Amino acid sequence: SIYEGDYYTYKKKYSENQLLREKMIIQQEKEVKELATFVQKAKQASQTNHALKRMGLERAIRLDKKKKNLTKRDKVYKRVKMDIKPNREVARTPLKVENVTFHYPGHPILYKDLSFQ
Amino acid sequence: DQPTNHLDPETQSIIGANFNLFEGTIIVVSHNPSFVEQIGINRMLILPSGNIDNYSPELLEYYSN
Amino acid sequence: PRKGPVAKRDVLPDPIYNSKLVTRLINRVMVDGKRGIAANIIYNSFDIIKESTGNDPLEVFEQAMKNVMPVLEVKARRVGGSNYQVPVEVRPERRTTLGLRWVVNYARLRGEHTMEERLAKEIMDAANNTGASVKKREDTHKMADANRAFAHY
Amino acid sequence: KNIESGVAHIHSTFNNTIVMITDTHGNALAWSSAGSLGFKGSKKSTPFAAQMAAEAATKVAMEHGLKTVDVTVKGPGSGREAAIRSLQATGLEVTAIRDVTPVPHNGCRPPKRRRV
RNA sequence: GCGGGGUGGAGCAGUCAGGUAGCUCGUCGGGCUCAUAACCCGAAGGUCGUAGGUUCAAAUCCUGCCCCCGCAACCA
RNA sequence: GUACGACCGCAAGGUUGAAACUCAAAGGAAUUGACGGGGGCCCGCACAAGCGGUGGAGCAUGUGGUUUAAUUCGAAGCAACG
RNA sequence: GGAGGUAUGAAAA
Protein backbone atom coordinates (compact mmCIF):
# COMPACT_ATOMS: atom_id res chain seq x y z
CA SER A 1 0.00 0.00 0.00
CA ILE A 2 1.30 3.43 -1.03
CA TYR A 3 0.28 6.61 0.81
CA GLU A 4 0.97 10.29 0.20
CA GLY A 5 2.60 12.10 3.10
CA ASP A 6 4.96 11.11 5.90
CA TYR A 7 5.23 8.29 8.43
CA TYR A 8 2.61 9.76 10.77
CA THR A 9 0.18 10.25 7.88
CA TYR A 10 0.64 6.60 6.95
CA LYS A 11 -0.01 5.55 10.54
CA LYS A 12 -3.07 7.80 10.72
CA LYS A 13 -4.46 6.53 7.41
CA TYR A 14 -3.61 2.92 8.27
CA SER A 15 -5.02 2.99 11.80
CA GLU A 16 -8.29 4.44 10.49
CA ASN A 17 -8.57 1.82 7.74
CA GLN A 18 -8.11 -1.08 10.16
CA LEU A 19 -10.64 0.57 12.48
CA LEU A 20 -13.18 1.01 9.67
CA ARG A 21 -12.50 -2.56 8.53
CA GLU A 22 -12.93 -3.84 12.09
CA LYS A 23 -16.34 -2.17 12.42
CA MET A 24 -17.46 -3.74 9.14
CA ILE A 25 -16.53 -7.23 10.35
CA ILE A 26 -18.32 -6.59 13.65
CA GLN A 27 -21.62 -5.76 11.97
CA GLN A 28 -21.38 -8.73 9.62
CA GLU A 29 -20.90 -10.95 12.68
CA LYS A 30 -23.93 -9.47 14.44
CA GLU A 31 -26.22 -10.23 11.50
CA VAL A 32 -24.83 -13.77 11.33
CA LYS A 33 -25.39 -14.22 15.07
CA GLU A 34 -28.94 -12.89 14.72
CA LEU A 35 -29.82 -15.39 11.99
CA ALA A 36 -28.00 -18.17 13.85
CA THR A 37 -30.01 -17.42 16.98
CA PHE A 38 -33.29 -17.66 15.08
CA VAL A 39 -32.24 -20.79 13.18
CA GLN A 40 -31.53 -22.49 16.50
CA LYS A 41 -34.86 -21.35 17.93
CA ALA A 42 -36.68 -22.96 15.01
CA LYS A 43 -34.48 -26.06 15.20
CA GLN A 44 -35.54 -26.75 18.80
CA ALA A 45 -39.21 -25.85 18.35
CA SER A 46 -41.86 -28.56 18.29
CA GLN A 47 -42.21 -30.46 15.03
CA THR A 48 -45.89 -29.47 15.15
CA ASN A 49 -45.09 -25.77 14.58
CA HIS A 50 -45.01 -26.01 10.80
CA ALA A 51 -44.68 -22.30 10.03
CA LEU A 52 -41.77 -21.78 12.43
CA LYS A 53 -40.01 -24.85 11.03
CA ARG A 54 -40.56 -23.43 7.54
CA MET A 55 -39.20 -20.01 8.49
CA GLY A 56 -36.23 -21.70 10.16
CA LEU A 57 -35.19 -23.36 6.91
CA GLU A 58 -35.65 -20.12 4.97
CA ARG A 59 -33.34 -18.30 7.39
CA ALA A 60 -30.92 -21.23 7.23
CA ILE A 61 -30.48 -20.39 3.55
CA ARG A 62 -29.77 -16.73 4.31
CA LEU A 63 -27.44 -17.78 7.13
CA ASP A 64 -25.48 -19.97 4.72
CA LYS A 65 -25.16 -17.16 2.18
CA LYS A 66 -24.04 -14.79 4.94
CA LYS A 67 -21.39 -17.17 6.26
CA LYS A 68 -19.99 -17.46 2.72
CA ASN A 69 -19.64 -13.67 2.24
CA LEU A 70 -18.36 -12.94 5.76
CA THR A 71 -14.99 -11.20 5.60
CA LYS A 72 -12.26 -12.76 7.72
CA ARG A 73 -10.45 -10.38 10.05
CA ASP A 74 -6.73 -10.47 9.31
CA LYS A 75 -4.72 -11.97 12.16
CA VAL A 76 -2.87 -9.10 13.82
CA TYR A 77 0.87 -9.65 13.51
CA LYS A 78 2.20 -10.90 16.83
CA ARG A 79 4.85 -8.84 18.63
CA VAL A 80 8.03 -10.16 20.22
CA LYS A 81 7.95 -11.23 23.87
CA MET A 82 11.22 -11.08 25.82
CA ASP A 83 11.68 -12.21 29.44
CA ILE A 84 15.39 -11.85 30.22
CA LYS A 85 16.30 -12.91 33.75
CA PRO A 86 19.75 -13.59 35.24
CA ASN A 87 20.47 -17.02 36.67
CA ARG A 88 22.83 -15.67 39.35
CA GLU A 89 23.09 -12.34 41.16
CA VAL A 90 25.31 -9.35 40.40
CA ALA A 91 28.10 -8.27 42.73
CA ARG A 92 29.04 -4.76 43.80
CA THR A 93 32.05 -5.05 41.45
CA PRO A 94 31.01 -7.11 38.41
CA LEU A 95 33.86 -5.93 36.18
CA LYS A 96 37.24 -4.39 37.06
CA VAL A 97 39.22 -2.59 34.35
CA GLU A 98 42.53 -1.15 35.55
CA ASN A 99 45.17 0.73 33.55
CA VAL A 100 44.17 -0.89 30.25
CA THR A 101 45.91 0.35 27.11
CA PHE A 102 45.25 -1.08 23.65
CA HIS A 103 46.28 -0.35 20.07
CA TYR A 104 45.63 -2.23 16.85
CA PRO A 105 49.10 -3.16 15.50
CA GLY A 106 50.26 -0.22 13.41
CA HIS A 107 47.70 2.35 14.62
CA PRO A 108 47.50 4.99 17.36
CA ILE A 109 46.62 3.91 20.89
CA LEU A 110 42.86 4.10 21.34
CA TYR A 111 43.02 4.62 25.12
CA LYS A 112 45.83 4.76 27.66
CA ASP A 113 45.64 3.41 31.21
CA LEU A 114 41.87 3.11 30.91
CA SER A 115 40.47 2.24 34.35
CA PHE A 116 36.80 1.95 35.28
CA GLN A 117 34.74 -0.16 37.67
CA ASP B 1 26.90 -3.37 20.92
CA GLN B 2 24.13 -1.46 19.13
CA PRO B 3 21.29 -3.90 19.94
CA THR B 4 18.48 -2.00 18.22
CA ASN B 5 20.27 -2.03 14.86
CA HIS B 6 18.33 -3.76 12.07
CA LEU B 7 15.25 -4.02 14.31
CA ASP B 8 11.88 -2.65 13.28
CA PRO B 9 10.65 0.32 15.34
CA GLU B 10 8.10 -1.78 17.22
CA THR B 11 10.69 -4.37 18.24
CA GLN B 12 13.11 -1.64 19.35
CA SER B 13 10.67 -0.30 21.95
CA ILE B 14 10.03 -3.85 23.19
CA ILE B 15 13.79 -4.42 23.45
CA GLY B 16 14.38 -1.21 25.38
CA ALA B 17 11.48 -1.70 27.78
CA ASN B 18 12.51 -5.24 28.70
CA PHE B 19 16.16 -4.28 29.21
CA ASN B 20 15.05 -1.44 31.48
CA LEU B 21 13.52 -4.09 33.75
CA PHE B 22 16.56 -6.38 33.46
CA GLU B 23 17.89 -7.21 36.93
CA GLY B 24 21.55 -7.13 35.96
CA THR B 25 24.42 -5.03 34.71
CA ILE B 26 24.19 -3.65 31.18
CA ILE B 27 27.16 -2.35 29.19
CA VAL B 28 25.50 -0.86 26.11
CA VAL B 29 26.48 1.10 23.01
CA SER B 30 23.72 2.83 21.06
CA HIS B 31 23.43 5.74 18.64
CA ASN B 32 19.63 5.56 18.97
CA PRO B 33 18.47 8.29 21.39
CA SER B 34 15.16 6.55 22.07
CA PHE B 35 16.69 3.21 23.06
CA VAL B 36 19.05 4.69 25.66
CA GLU B 37 16.23 6.69 27.24
CA GLN B 38 14.11 3.58 27.76
CA ILE B 39 16.97 1.67 29.38
CA GLY B 40 17.60 4.57 31.75
CA ILE B 41 21.38 4.82 31.68
CA ASN B 42 23.19 5.41 34.98
CA ARG B 43 26.84 6.12 34.08
CA MET B 44 28.24 7.07 30.68
CA LEU B 45 31.85 6.51 29.60
CA ILE B 46 32.93 9.01 26.95
CA LEU B 47 35.50 8.24 24.27
CA PRO B 48 38.18 8.85 23.21
CA SER B 49 38.56 11.21 26.17
CA GLY B 50 38.08 8.75 29.01
CA ASN B 51 35.39 10.22 31.27
CA ILE B 52 33.43 7.99 33.66
CA ASP B 53 30.42 10.24 34.30
CA ASN B 54 26.94 10.05 35.77
CA TYR B 55 24.33 9.81 33.04
CA SER B 56 22.28 12.93 32.35
CA PRO B 57 21.19 15.28 29.53
CA GLU B 58 24.84 16.30 29.80
CA LEU B 59 25.29 13.46 27.29
CA LEU B 60 24.30 16.12 24.76
CA GLU B 61 27.07 18.38 26.06
CA TYR B 62 29.68 15.72 25.29
CA TYR B 63 28.13 15.16 21.86
CA SER B 64 28.28 18.90 21.14
CA ASN B 65 31.89 19.03 22.34
CA PRO C 1 11.38 20.37 71.32
CA ARG C 2 8.51 22.69 72.25
CA LYS C 3 10.48 24.96 74.59
CA GLY C 4 12.89 26.23 71.94
CA PRO C 5 16.31 25.69 70.38
CA VAL C 6 18.69 23.78 72.62
CA ALA C 7 22.42 24.09 73.20
CA LYS C 8 24.65 22.38 70.63
CA ARG C 9 27.47 20.36 72.18
CA ASP C 10 30.88 21.27 70.81
CA VAL C 11 33.64 19.18 69.22
CA LEU C 12 37.39 19.56 69.67
CA PRO C 13 39.65 19.68 66.59
CA ASP C 14 41.20 16.56 65.14
CA PRO C 15 44.47 15.63 66.90
CA ILE C 16 46.58 15.45 63.72
CA TYR C 17 44.68 17.51 61.13
CA ASN C 18 43.55 20.06 63.74
CA SER C 19 40.06 20.22 62.25
CA LYS C 20 36.66 19.95 63.89
CA LEU C 21 35.35 18.65 60.56
CA VAL C 22 37.58 15.57 60.72
CA THR C 23 36.36 14.92 64.26
CA ARG C 24 32.77 15.10 63.01
CA LEU C 25 33.70 12.65 60.24
CA ILE C 26 35.12 10.27 62.85
CA ASN C 27 31.90 10.61 64.85
CA ARG C 28 29.74 9.83 61.81
CA VAL C 29 31.78 6.76 60.82
CA MET C 30 31.96 5.54 64.42
CA VAL C 31 29.86 2.58 65.57
CA ASP C 32 29.10 1.45 69.13
CA GLY C 33 31.44 4.05 70.58
CA LYS C 34 34.45 2.37 68.93
CA ARG C 35 36.13 5.71 68.30
CA GLY C 36 39.57 4.10 68.02
CA ILE C 37 38.54 2.01 65.02
CA ALA C 38 36.69 5.01 63.58
CA ALA C 39 39.71 7.32 63.80
CA ASN C 40 42.06 4.69 62.36
CA ILE C 41 39.77 4.22 59.35
CA ILE C 42 39.58 7.97 58.75
CA TYR C 43 43.36 8.38 58.92
CA ASN C 44 43.97 5.40 56.63
CA SER C 45 41.53 6.87 54.11
CA PHE C 46 43.29 10.24 54.27
CA ASP C 47 46.63 8.51 53.71
CA ILE C 48 45.19 6.77 50.65
CA ILE C 49 43.94 10.13 49.36
CA LYS C 50 47.37 11.72 49.76
CA GLU C 51 48.98 8.72 48.06
CA SER C 52 46.65 8.42 45.06
CA THR C 53 46.54 12.24 44.77
CA GLY C 54 49.31 14.65 45.66
CA ASN C 55 46.84 17.14 47.12
CA ASP C 56 46.34 17.44 50.86
CA PRO C 57 43.62 15.01 52.01
CA LEU C 58 42.17 17.78 54.17
CA GLU C 59 41.74 20.00 51.11
CA VAL C 60 40.32 17.09 49.11
CA PHE C 61 37.83 16.33 51.88
CA GLU C 62 36.77 19.98 52.01
CA GLN C 63 36.31 19.89 48.23
CA ALA C 64 34.13 16.78 48.57
CA MET C 65 32.06 18.50 51.26
CA LYS C 66 31.55 21.53 49.03
CA ASN C 67 30.40 19.27 46.20
CA VAL C 68 28.08 17.11 48.32
CA MET C 69 26.67 19.61 50.81
CA PRO C 70 23.19 20.58 49.54
CA VAL C 71 21.68 24.08 49.38
CA LEU C 72 17.91 23.60 49.02
CA GLU C 73 16.13 20.68 50.69
CA VAL C 74 12.49 19.62 50.48
CA LYS C 75 10.32 19.44 53.61
CA ALA C 76 6.98 17.64 53.42
CA ARG C 77 3.90 19.70 54.28
CA ARG C 78 0.36 18.36 54.66
CA VAL C 79 -1.99 20.94 53.11
CA GLY C 80 -5.57 19.88 53.73
CA GLY C 81 -6.19 16.65 51.86
CA SER C 82 -3.01 17.02 49.79
CA ASN C 83 0.55 16.38 50.99
CA TYR C 84 3.45 17.67 48.90
CA GLN C 85 7.04 18.81 49.26
CA VAL C 86 8.22 22.37 49.85
CA PRO C 87 11.69 23.80 49.08
CA VAL C 88 13.75 25.03 52.02
CA GLU C 89 17.21 26.53 52.25
CA VAL C 90 19.55 24.42 54.38
CA ARG C 91 21.17 26.03 57.40
CA PRO C 92 24.95 25.46 57.42
CA GLU C 93 24.82 23.07 60.38
CA ARG C 94 22.44 20.71 58.57
CA ARG C 95 24.47 21.24 55.39
CA THR C 96 27.58 19.71 56.94
CA THR C 97 25.48 17.05 58.66
CA LEU C 98 23.84 16.01 55.39
CA GLY C 99 27.17 16.09 53.57
CA LEU C 100 28.81 13.82 56.13
CA ARG C 101 25.74 11.57 56.30
CA TRP C 102 25.60 11.07 52.53
CA VAL C 103 29.35 10.51 52.22
CA VAL C 104 29.48 7.86 54.95
CA ASN C 105 26.34 6.04 53.78
CA TYR C 106 27.39 5.80 50.13
CA ALA C 107 30.93 4.88 51.16
CA ARG C 108 29.55 1.98 53.20
CA LEU C 109 27.56 0.91 50.13
CA ARG C 110 30.64 0.99 47.88
CA GLY C 111 32.11 -2.25 46.58
CA GLU C 112 35.67 -2.00 47.90
CA HIS C 113 36.59 -4.62 50.48
CA THR C 114 37.77 -2.29 53.26
CA MET C 115 35.91 0.67 54.73
CA GLU C 116 38.84 3.09 54.52
CA GLU C 117 39.31 2.18 50.87
CA ARG C 118 35.59 2.73 50.25
CA LEU C 119 35.73 6.05 52.10
CA ALA C 120 38.80 7.23 50.19
CA LYS C 121 37.28 6.34 46.83
CA GLU C 122 34.01 8.08 47.69
CA ILE C 123 35.79 11.20 48.96
CA MET C 124 37.95 11.49 45.85
CA ASP C 125 34.95 11.04 43.55
CA ALA C 126 32.95 13.65 45.46
CA ALA C 127 35.86 16.09 45.19
CA ASN C 128 35.92 15.41 41.44
CA ASN C 129 32.16 16.17 41.48
CA THR C 130 31.01 12.63 40.66
CA GLY C 131 29.70 9.56 42.44
CA ALA C 132 26.72 8.50 44.51
CA SER C 133 27.02 11.36 47.01
CA VAL C 134 27.10 14.01 44.29
CA LYS C 135 24.17 12.24 42.64
CA LYS C 136 22.19 12.48 45.87
CA ARG C 137 22.85 16.22 46.07
CA GLU C 138 21.80 16.62 42.44
CA ASP C 139 18.57 14.72 43.10
CA THR C 140 17.82 16.83 46.17
CA HIS C 141 18.32 20.03 44.18
CA LYS C 142 16.26 18.58 41.34
CA MET C 143 13.38 17.77 43.70
CA ALA C 144 13.56 21.26 45.20
CA ASP C 145 13.54 22.85 41.74
CA ALA C 146 10.63 20.67 40.61
CA ASN C 147 8.58 21.76 43.63
CA ARG C 148 9.91 25.32 43.35
CA ALA C 149 6.34 26.51 42.70
CA PHE C 150 5.71 26.21 46.46
CA ALA C 151 8.58 28.44 47.62
CA HIS C 152 6.12 30.99 49.03
CA TYR C 153 5.29 28.59 51.88
CA LYS D 1 5.64 41.91 12.64
CA ASN D 2 7.08 45.02 14.31
CA ILE D 3 5.31 46.81 17.17
CA GLU D 4 6.39 49.16 19.95
CA SER D 5 3.33 49.70 22.18
CA GLY D 6 0.84 47.06 23.24
CA VAL D 7 -1.54 45.81 25.90
CA ALA D 8 -1.06 42.85 28.24
CA HIS D 9 -4.21 41.11 29.47
CA ILE D 10 -3.60 38.95 32.55
CA HIS D 11 -6.50 36.54 33.12
CA SER D 12 -5.82 35.03 36.55
CA THR D 13 -8.37 32.58 37.96
CA PHE D 14 -8.13 30.34 41.00
CA ASN D 15 -7.15 27.44 38.72
CA ASN D 16 -5.06 28.98 35.93
CA THR D 17 -3.36 32.16 34.75
CA ILE D 18 -3.23 33.33 31.13
CA VAL D 19 -1.08 36.18 29.79
CA MET D 20 -2.15 37.66 26.45
CA ILE D 21 0.01 40.43 24.98
CA THR D 22 -1.84 42.20 22.16
CA ASP D 23 -1.40 45.37 20.17
CA THR D 24 -3.18 48.52 21.31
CA HIS D 25 -6.06 47.47 19.01
CA GLY D 26 -6.47 44.11 20.76
CA ASN D 27 -5.04 41.92 18.00
CA ALA D 28 -3.19 39.08 19.70
CA LEU D 29 0.60 39.08 19.38
CA ALA D 30 1.75 36.47 21.90
CA TRP D 31 0.31 34.54 24.81
CA SER D 32 1.14 31.87 27.36
CA SER D 33 -0.38 30.17 30.39
CA ALA D 34 0.59 28.03 33.35
CA GLY D 35 -0.91 24.99 31.65
CA SER D 36 0.82 25.89 28.39
CA LEU D 37 4.14 25.84 30.27
CA GLY D 38 3.51 22.33 31.61
CA PHE D 39 2.17 23.18 35.07
CA LYS D 40 -0.69 20.83 35.95
CA GLY D 41 -3.23 20.54 38.73
CA SER D 42 -2.89 22.91 41.65
CA LYS D 43 0.45 24.22 40.36
CA LYS D 44 -1.31 26.13 37.57
CA SER D 45 -2.56 28.68 40.12
CA THR D 46 0.78 29.20 41.87
CA PRO D 47 2.30 32.69 41.44
CA PHE D 48 5.50 31.05 40.17
CA ALA D 49 3.56 29.52 37.28
CA ALA D 50 2.12 32.96 36.54
CA GLN D 51 5.67 34.32 36.67
CA MET D 52 6.88 31.81 34.08
CA ALA D 53 3.84 32.36 31.85
CA ALA D 54 4.37 36.12 31.78
CA GLU D 55 8.08 35.56 31.16
CA ALA D 56 7.53 33.28 28.16
CA ALA D 57 4.83 35.48 26.62
CA THR D 58 7.00 38.58 27.07
CA LYS D 59 9.99 36.91 25.43
CA VAL D 60 7.93 35.99 22.37
CA ALA D 61 6.47 39.50 22.19
CA MET D 62 9.89 41.15 22.50
CA GLU D 63 11.24 38.75 19.88
CA HIS D 64 8.41 39.96 17.64
CA GLY D 65 9.44 43.50 18.58
CA LEU D 66 7.77 45.29 21.47
CA LYS D 67 8.98 47.69 24.17
CA THR D 68 6.06 49.20 26.12
CA VAL D 69 2.91 47.49 27.38
CA ASP D 70 -0.04 48.58 29.51
CA VAL D 71 -1.38 45.93 31.88
CA THR D 72 -5.03 44.97 32.36
CA VAL D 73 -5.68 42.56 35.24
CA LYS D 74 -8.74 40.31 35.22
CA GLY D 75 -9.92 37.54 37.52
CA PRO D 76 -9.30 36.88 41.22
CA GLY D 77 -6.17 34.73 40.76
CA SER D 78 -3.21 35.09 43.12
CA GLY D 79 -0.58 35.38 40.37
CA ARG D 80 -1.37 38.85 39.03
CA GLU D 81 1.49 40.64 40.79
CA ALA D 82 3.90 37.82 39.94
CA ALA D 83 3.04 38.20 36.26
CA ILE D 84 3.50 41.98 36.42
CA ARG D 85 6.93 41.64 38.04
CA SER D 86 7.85 38.99 35.47
CA LEU D 87 6.92 41.40 32.68
CA GLN D 88 9.15 44.12 34.14
CA ALA D 89 12.04 41.71 34.65
CA THR D 90 11.82 40.31 31.11
CA GLY D 91 12.08 43.89 29.88
CA LEU D 92 8.74 45.23 28.67
CA GLU D 93 8.07 48.64 30.21
CA VAL D 94 4.87 48.60 32.29
CA THR D 95 3.28 51.89 31.25
CA ALA D 96 0.07 51.52 33.28
CA ILE D 97 -1.92 48.97 35.26
CA ARG D 98 -5.72 48.74 35.39
CA ASP D 99 -8.16 46.15 36.72
CA VAL D 100 -10.97 45.05 34.41
CA THR D 101 -12.59 42.42 36.61
CA PRO D 102 -16.22 42.44 35.41
CA VAL D 103 -18.64 43.64 38.08
CA PRO D 104 -22.26 42.73 37.27
CA HIS D 105 -24.84 45.21 38.55
CA ASN D 106 -26.67 42.28 40.12
CA GLY D 107 -27.42 40.96 36.64
CA CYS D 108 -27.49 37.19 36.30
CA ARG D 109 -27.84 34.55 39.00
CA PRO D 110 -24.50 32.95 39.97
CA PRO D 111 -24.31 29.15 40.31
CA LYS D 112 -25.10 27.41 43.56
CA ARG D 113 -22.85 27.35 46.60
CA ARG D 114 -20.62 24.31 46.93
CA ARG D 115 -21.29 21.52 49.43
CA VAL D 116 -25.04 21.94 49.78
C1' G E 1 -32.95 -35.49 18.80
C1' C E 2 -31.42 -29.85 18.69
C1' G E 3 -28.24 -26.47 21.09
C1' G E 4 -25.38 -24.40 25.24
C1' G E 5 -21.43 -25.37 28.84
C1' G E 6 -17.35 -28.17 31.92
C1' U E 7 -10.34 -23.49 33.79
C1' G E 8 -8.59 -22.04 41.51
C1' G E 9 -13.85 -21.93 46.61
C1' A E 10 -17.63 -18.91 43.23
C1' G E 11 -18.14 -16.19 38.94
C1' C E 12 -15.33 -15.19 34.48
C1' A E 13 -11.15 -14.44 30.66
C1' G E 14 -7.85 -16.95 27.79
C1' U E 15 -10.12 -21.36 23.23
C1' C E 16 -11.16 -18.95 17.14
C1' A E 17 -5.63 -17.84 15.61
C1' G E 18 -0.58 -24.28 19.45
C1' G E 19 4.17 -22.16 23.21
C1' U E 20 3.48 -18.31 28.64
C1' A E 21 -2.37 -20.56 32.99
C1' G E 22 -4.81 -15.45 34.33
C1' C E 23 -9.09 -11.21 36.39
C1' U E 24 -12.85 -10.38 40.21
C1' C E 25 -14.76 -11.73 44.57
C1' G E 26 -13.87 -15.10 48.18
C1' U E 27 -10.50 -18.10 51.81
C1' C E 28 -5.85 -18.47 55.14
C1' G E 29 -1.90 -15.65 57.73
C1' G E 30 0.01 -10.96 59.44
C1' G E 31 -0.86 -5.66 59.99
C1' C E 32 -4.03 -0.99 61.45
C1' U E 33 -8.38 -0.33 65.27
C1' C E 34 -10.39 -0.16 72.17
C1' A E 35 -13.01 -3.88 68.84
C1' U E 36 -15.63 -4.94 63.99
C1' A E 37 -15.99 -3.08 59.06
C1' A E 38 -13.35 -0.59 55.45
C1' C E 39 -8.03 -0.22 54.39
C1' C E 40 -2.62 -2.22 53.97
C1' C E 41 0.94 -6.50 53.31
C1' G E 42 1.96 -11.63 52.30
C1' A E 43 0.19 -16.83 50.80
C1' A E 44 -2.48 -20.57 49.07
C1' G E 45 -5.92 -22.41 45.91
C1' G E 46 -6.45 -25.43 39.04
C1' U E 47 -1.90 -29.55 35.65
C1' C E 48 -8.06 -26.30 32.20
C1' G E 49 -14.44 -32.41 32.92
C1' U E 50 -12.50 -37.08 31.16
C1' A E 51 -9.85 -40.82 27.55
C1' G E 52 -7.37 -41.13 23.06
C1' G E 53 -5.26 -38.92 18.52
C1' U E 54 -2.50 -34.27 15.72
C1' U E 55 2.11 -31.74 16.96
C1' C E 56 8.51 -30.51 18.61
C1' A E 57 4.79 -28.65 21.79
C1' A E 58 -2.51 -29.07 23.24
C1' A E 59 -6.57 -25.31 28.26
C1' U E 60 -6.50 -24.03 22.79
C1' C E 61 -7.03 -28.48 17.08
C1' C E 62 -9.52 -33.49 16.07
C1' U E 63 -12.58 -38.00 18.10
C1' G E 64 -15.29 -40.31 21.62
C1' C E 65 -16.99 -40.54 26.34
C1' C E 66 -19.26 -38.53 31.36
C1' C E 67 -21.66 -34.82 33.59
C1' C E 68 -25.05 -29.96 34.00
C1' C E 69 -28.63 -26.45 31.64
C1' G E 70 -32.74 -25.14 27.96
C1' C E 71 -35.90 -27.02 24.05
C1' A E 72 -38.25 -31.09 21.38
C1' A E 73 -40.20 -35.92 21.15
C1' C E 74 -45.98 -34.99 16.54
C1' C E 75 -49.04 -32.00 13.52
C1' A E 76 -55.80 -32.33 9.96
C1' G F 1 -53.27 16.21 61.53
C1' U F 2 -54.60 9.87 60.52
C1' A F 3 -60.01 7.46 59.81
C1' C F 4 -65.34 8.60 58.74
C1' G F 5 -68.53 12.49 57.19
C1' A F 6 -68.85 17.17 55.03
C1' C F 7 -66.86 21.47 52.05
C1' C F 8 -63.26 23.25 48.50
C1' G F 9 -59.68 21.88 44.25
C1' C F 10 -58.56 20.05 37.19
C1' A F 11 -55.06 17.69 40.03
C1' A F 12 -51.63 17.82 43.81
C1' G F 13 -54.09 18.25 47.89
C1' G F 14 -56.37 22.12 51.59
C1' U F 15 -60.29 23.23 55.76
C1' U F 16 -62.99 20.76 59.66
C1' G F 17 -61.53 16.55 62.54
C1' A F 18 -61.95 11.80 66.10
C1' A F 19 -61.88 6.99 68.42
C1' A F 20 -59.89 2.19 69.59
C1' C F 21 -55.09 1.14 71.16
C1' U F 22 -50.43 2.17 73.55
C1' C F 23 -46.38 4.46 77.37
C1' A F 24 -45.15 6.81 82.42
C1' A F 25 -43.26 9.56 80.88
C1' A F 26 -42.99 13.54 76.61
C1' G F 27 -41.44 18.52 77.59
C1' G F 28 -39.21 24.11 78.74
C1' A F 29 -35.18 26.54 81.08
C1' A F 30 -30.91 26.30 83.46
C1' U F 31 -26.61 23.63 86.21
C1' U F 32 -22.02 20.22 86.67
C1' G F 33 -19.47 17.14 83.94
C1' A F 34 -18.00 14.38 79.55
C1' C F 35 -17.61 14.80 74.49
C1' G F 36 -16.90 17.54 69.11
C1' G F 37 -14.15 15.49 62.10
C1' G F 38 -15.60 23.65 67.81
C1' G F 39 -12.19 27.62 69.02
C1' G F 40 -7.92 29.78 72.04
C1' C F 41 -3.37 28.84 74.92
C1' C F 42 0.13 25.06 76.63
C1' C F 43 3.02 20.59 77.82
C1' G F 44 5.42 15.24 77.36
C1' C F 45 10.93 10.80 72.80
C1' A F 46 4.02 12.99 71.03
C1' C F 47 5.31 14.06 66.38
C1' A F 48 9.22 16.31 63.68
C1' A F 49 15.27 15.81 63.36
C1' G F 50 18.46 11.65 64.03
C1' C F 51 20.73 6.77 66.17
C1' G F 52 19.80 1.92 66.84
C1' G F 53 16.25 -1.85 66.76
C1' U F 54 11.49 -5.37 66.27
C1' G F 55 8.53 -7.63 62.19
C1' G F 56 12.48 -11.71 57.96
C1' A F 57 16.35 -16.49 59.97
C1' G F 58 18.20 -20.20 64.25
C1' C F 59 17.60 -20.54 69.28
C1' A F 60 15.84 -18.98 74.65
C1' U F 61 11.47 -17.58 77.01
C1' G F 62 6.04 -16.26 77.93
C1' U F 63 1.28 -16.48 75.81
C1' G F 64 -2.81 -18.32 72.67
C1' G F 65 -4.37 -22.48 70.07
C1' U F 66 -4.28 -27.71 69.70
C1' U F 67 -3.13 -32.16 72.18
C1' U F 68 -2.89 -34.92 76.74
C1' A F 69 -4.07 -38.94 82.20
C1' A F 70 -2.53 -34.15 83.76
C1' U F 71 -0.52 -30.86 80.28
C1' U F 72 -2.11 -26.99 88.07
C1' C F 73 -3.82 -22.05 89.11
C1' G F 74 -3.69 -16.78 88.25
C1' A F 75 -2.56 -12.31 84.54
C1' A F 76 -6.01 -10.45 78.77
C1' G F 77 -5.45 -3.05 74.82
C1' C F 78 -2.68 0.82 76.54
C1' A F 79 -2.34 -0.84 82.15
C1' A F 80 -1.93 -9.73 80.03
C1' C F 81 2.25 -12.43 77.57
C1' G F 82 11.57 -13.24 80.31
C1' G G 1 -18.23 43.12 74.47
C1' G G 2 -23.63 42.12 71.90
C1' A G 3 -27.53 42.17 67.00
C1' G G 4 -29.15 41.81 61.19
C1' G G 5 -27.27 41.08 55.65
C1' U G 6 -23.13 38.95 53.38
C1' A G 7 -19.25 3.40 59.13
C1' U G 8 -20.57 0.73 63.49
C1' G G 9 -20.56 -0.43 69.11
C1' A G 10 -25.99 -6.71 71.44
C1' A G 11 -29.82 -6.99 76.67
C1' A G 12 -30.35 -5.71 82.04
C1' A G 13 -27.72 -3.40 86.06
Ligand SMILES: [K+]
Ligand atom coordinates in the same frame (compact mmCIF):
# COMPACT_ATOMS: atom_id res chain seq x y z
K1 LIG H 1 14.79 -7.75 62.46
Ligand SMILES: [K+]
Ligand atom coordinates in the same frame (compact mmCIF):
# COMPACT_ATOMS: atom_id res chain seq x y z
K1 LIG I 1 11.63 -11.33 68.56
Ligand SMILES: [Mg+2]
Ligand atom coordinates in the same frame (compact mmCIF):
# COMPACT_ATOMS: atom_id res chain seq x y z
MG1 LIG J 1 10.28 9.93 64.49
Ligand SMILES: [Mg+2]
Ligand atom coordinates in the same frame (compact mmCIF):
# COMPACT_ATOMS: atom_id res chain seq x y z
MG1 LIG K 1 11.87 -12.66 64.32
